[PDB]
């Protein structure tokens, strides 16, 4: 792999793969992605972190906002509230390897010059247009506030503000970016990763939908998790034992069953594991048990930085 | 007349009676009201000015925001036009003998704890409920744009940035001065004027629609318009020219007609020339005639003054 096939792998869309190839040739390349402040950090934010580390070897300027004003415009709670939880996040992404520039959007998005952009792309935003990008990133509410037609231009001002080369996110932010490429004198190039599945198979894994599985779970935890996790035989699709097969496990992958099961059944890349569980040559326990354990060990380095801290 | 009575007349609503009361007692108070720059100041722009001349002629500290920037949302142009017309509007409202403290909207709206507190306006109001104040008030717009709905949490956040006592302005602010009253913690108390009808009878006067009588219309071009107006004989609402009548004529109002028509007619108050309309007594071609002169003899001085500049 050459390094824009590096950054490719594991993506669902670059937008657009020849704007991409003009921006590597660059000796200077930023790109950015930003994060509401949780309380997990699960595998969806590990998945777009080895994102920004392969961009990060591939010589770009990574910079990751702790959108404090983001998460309280979209109902998160309080901003100081918010604020110490972003610190907590940057520990955990500083812990999976990455580091960056970590910044709260707060620290620009008061400038009376980042203001101004925002009257003037809310002039150049449609409602319909602003409620369309949101559907897929908005907290519910019956009753949609104002702060909901905020959040996107908010978003688009501060890749225009900010000035990165390529950002980056999952498909739910599809909509923004594609925004952000009408309106911007600068076309971003977007970069844009796979939404993981929900461990009950119902939706995507989402932080407050308990359906996750976060990166300092202890190794019980998860074998639990992916025991009751939906993983139908021979479907790969919406299967999310097959995912953290595909995006996280290193191969040659090693599976080890017992003799009167098969025996140990070694797998030299995704592929072949996915062509094995499509014909029931591969048992959903044999692969929770494989998935499980290869997990835990690609975990345990970084529960282990943060059990350190205690 | 008290003071009280003074404020109230001419008035469609009072926000609430009780609490202008306490206002009243205070030493100092506020009352401020916004203009977006218009390229022609009508008679609605003057029966606010009036009001606002009320206010001052009653203890009060008159604020006029010439709202630069809520022209630019509701899509009136570029700023540095905007501004020098609401330069030249100033000189006009001064003309009219309002001496006041005219400030932009942009002085204010660019700092930062106003530009936080408006995210926190955002939280609070839903975007059915900023639609619905800003459906007498948006510019026509087949796809309406983000800018609509930061529209009115913009001036929510003004009067609450800026503390002033009582708001005025037409009725169709009412639903933008009920949503301040709802989430602020000071409730500002609503001074509404009524709305005039156009001159043709069908909508508002609006100076976008080429129904009104500028305050500098040559007496010529007063005389035109008014012969032209929607006046039906017996019919009180909805017509501008009795409009016109109540609310800046001065009575006792000397009715010049040639006496083949009955001679000249003195009427005493506005009730009592709404009682000679209303059973056709009096004839719409002499209650043209008068409104006409005496209208000129209003505006000129207001004409003179800009006139003078020349
Ligand atoms: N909308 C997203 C959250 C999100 C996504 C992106 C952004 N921020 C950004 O796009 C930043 C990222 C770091 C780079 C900063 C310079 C400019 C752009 C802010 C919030 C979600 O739903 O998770
Ligand atoms: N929405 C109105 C325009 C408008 C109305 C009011 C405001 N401004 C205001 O409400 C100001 C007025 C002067 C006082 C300033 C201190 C705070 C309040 C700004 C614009 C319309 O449609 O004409």
Redesign the interface.
């Known amino acids: 792999m050459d390094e824009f096939e590096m950054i490719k792998r594991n993506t669902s869309e670059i937008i657009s793969e020849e704007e991409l190839r003009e921006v590597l040739k660059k000796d200077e390349k930023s790109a950015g992605i930003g994060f509401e402040p949780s309380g997990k950090i699960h595998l969806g934010h590990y998945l777009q972190i080895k994102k920004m580390i392969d961009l990060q070897n591939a010589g770009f300027d990574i910079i990751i906002e702790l959108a404090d004003?983001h998460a309280?415009?979209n109902?998160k709670g309080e901003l100081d509230e918010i604020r110490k939880i972003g610190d907590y996040n940057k520990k955990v992404f500083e812990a999976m390897g990455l580091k960056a520039k970590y910044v709260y959007g707060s620290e620009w998005m008061?400038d009376?010059d980042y203001?101004?952009n925002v009257?003037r792309?809310?002039?150049?935003?449609?409602?319909?247009r602003?409620?369309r990008s949101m559907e897929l990133i908005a907290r519910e509410d019956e009753?949609?506030?104002?702060?909901?037609?905020?959040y996107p231009?908010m978003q688009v001002n501060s890749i225009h503000y900010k000035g990165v080369d390529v950002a980056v996110g999952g498909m739910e932010q599809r909509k923004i970016h594609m925004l952000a490429r009408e309106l911007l004198p600068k076309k971003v190039v977007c970069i844009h990763n796979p939404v993981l599945t929900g461990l009950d198979g119902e939706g995507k894994m989402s932080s407050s939908k308990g359906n996750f599985i976060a990166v300092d779970d202890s190794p019980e935890e998860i074998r639990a998790k992916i025991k009751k996790a939906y993983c139908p035989a021979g479907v790969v699709e919406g299967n999310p034992i097959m995912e953290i097969a595909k995006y996280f496990l290193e191969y040659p992958l090693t599976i080890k069953r017992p003799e009167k099961f098969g025996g140990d059944l070694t797998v030299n890349s995704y592929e072949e594991l996915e062509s094995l569980f499509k014909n029931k040559e591969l048992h959903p326990m044999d692969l929770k048990n494989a998935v499980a354990e290869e997990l835990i060990k690609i975990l345990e380095p970084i529960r282990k930085r943060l059990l350190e801290h205690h």
């Open positions: 004003l309280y415009l109902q008061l009376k203001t101004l009257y792309l809310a002039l150049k935003t449609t409602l319909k602003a409620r009753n949609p506030k104002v702060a909901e037609v905020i231009i």
